[PDB]
Amino acid sequence: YELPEDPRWELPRDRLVLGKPLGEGAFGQVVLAEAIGLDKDKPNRVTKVAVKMLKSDATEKDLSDLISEMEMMKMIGKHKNIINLLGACTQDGPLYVIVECASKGNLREYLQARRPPGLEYSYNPSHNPEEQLSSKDLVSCAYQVARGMEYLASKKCIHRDLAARNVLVTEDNVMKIADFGLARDHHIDYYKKTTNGRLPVKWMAPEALFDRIYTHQSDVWSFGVLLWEIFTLGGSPYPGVPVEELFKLLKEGHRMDKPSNCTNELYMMMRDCWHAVPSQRPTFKQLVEDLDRIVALTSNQE
Numbered sequence: 401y402e403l404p405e406d407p408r409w410e411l412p413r414d415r416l417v418l419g420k421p422l423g424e425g426a427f428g429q430v431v432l433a434e435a436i437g438l439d440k441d442k443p444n445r446v447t448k449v450a451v452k453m454l455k456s457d458a459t460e461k462d463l464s465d466l467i468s469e470m471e472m473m474k475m476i477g478k479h480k481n482i483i484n485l486l487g488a489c490t491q492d493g494p495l496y497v498i499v500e501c502a503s504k505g506n507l508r509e510y511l512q513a514r515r516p517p518g519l520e521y522s523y524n525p526s527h528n529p530e531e532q533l534s535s536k537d538l539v540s541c542a543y544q545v546a547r548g549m550e551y552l553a554s555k556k557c558i559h560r561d562l563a564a565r566n567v568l569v570t571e572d573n574v575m576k577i578a579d580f581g582l583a584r585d586h587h588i589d590y591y592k593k594t595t596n597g598r599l600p601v602k603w604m605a606p607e608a609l610f611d612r613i614y615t616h617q618s619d620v621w622s623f624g625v626l627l628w629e630i631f632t633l634g635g636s637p638y639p640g641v642p643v644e645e646l647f648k649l650l651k652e653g654h655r656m657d658k659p660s661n662c663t664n665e666l667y668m669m670m671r672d673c674w675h676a677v678p679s680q681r682p683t684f685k686q687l688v689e690d691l692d693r694i695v696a697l698t699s700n701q702e
């Protein structure tokens with residue numbers, strides 16, 4: 401019913417101006433807001449933020465889940481390439497958990513919107529994107545996510561749904577991993593789709609999917625799907641493949657084709673992330689180093 405206070409994280413309710421809803425998830429409700437004086441050394445500055453709170457179908461467990469998500473984010477600490485906790489309103493009112501706002505949306509969308517222009521044969525011939533990404537920009541998205549994941553892994557955090565939908569992009573084009581404070585924990589609805597109508601099982605390592613074993617190595621497999629999403633500019637993995645057929649593909653050792661405009665080296669990295677044997681996949685630390693080297697050598701002229 402009523403909560404302890406942590407003074408270092410506490411923001412007075414009068415310092416938070418709630419704004420338009422962003423929507424309900426399984427988790428809770430989120431709203432855009434403006435927070436005044438988040439920093440001690442800057443008490444007149446307004447920061448745009450996102451705020452999580454319970455929905456009025458107020459569940460019970462959901463309160464302990466929202467608390468747990470906040471508390472985990474406190475324990476993980478701050479990193480440039482994750483969505484960071486900025487504050488909370490815990491006293492004399494509903495729990496509000498306040499986090500960084502990433503203004504350019506999720507990565508899947510950010511890549512889709514920057515696809516090259518529509519042609520005579522396209523689904524969308526008048527698609528004329530505002531911005532375009534070079535080969536270096538794409539490698540650089542990959543590097544930034546890997547660096548975020550390396551950080552999380554060093555804090556003993558296993559994500560368990562790494563995908564472009566769960567990477568967010570700031571106004572400065574920084575990649576931030578989202579929804580890393582959660583738990584699942586059971587196998588949910590292997591058939592439940594995402595808002596965009598996709599099946600999360602398509603990002604899951606076979607040992608997680610078949611033996612419920614989730615490790616840093618299973619997140620590396622998901623990262624390889626993410627790489628494939630980046631280099632297809634927000635492509636959808638296994639389009640038209642239902643769950644039962646996906647299981648069969650994995651049991652046969654099937655692997656996705658190399659996307660066009662992907663080097664053999666980046667395809668090898670993908671495939672190595674998709675090693676059948678988890679011990680043989682690269683780690684996030686190695687993916688960070690490799691991607692750092694590749695970025696430096698990748699052309700920004702196309």
Ligand SMILES: *CCC(=O)Nc1cc(N2CCN(CC)CC2)ccc1Nc1cc(N(C)C(=O)Nc2c(Cl)c(OC)cc(OC)c2Cl)ncn1
Pocket residue numbers: 422430432448449450451452469470483497499500501502503504505506568577578579580581
């Ligand atoms: C401040 C962010 C913003 O301005 N908008 C925003 C919009 C979107 N869109 C998705 C759907 N599009 C329709 C086509 C419209 C654009 C996507 C992302 C952002 N930024 C954003 C969103 C969120 N959300 C929704 C959160 O739930 N954030 C959040 C996270 Cl990631 C985590 O991660 C651990 C934890 C909590 O609470 C504990 C929350 Cl609230 N956040 C940030 N930025």
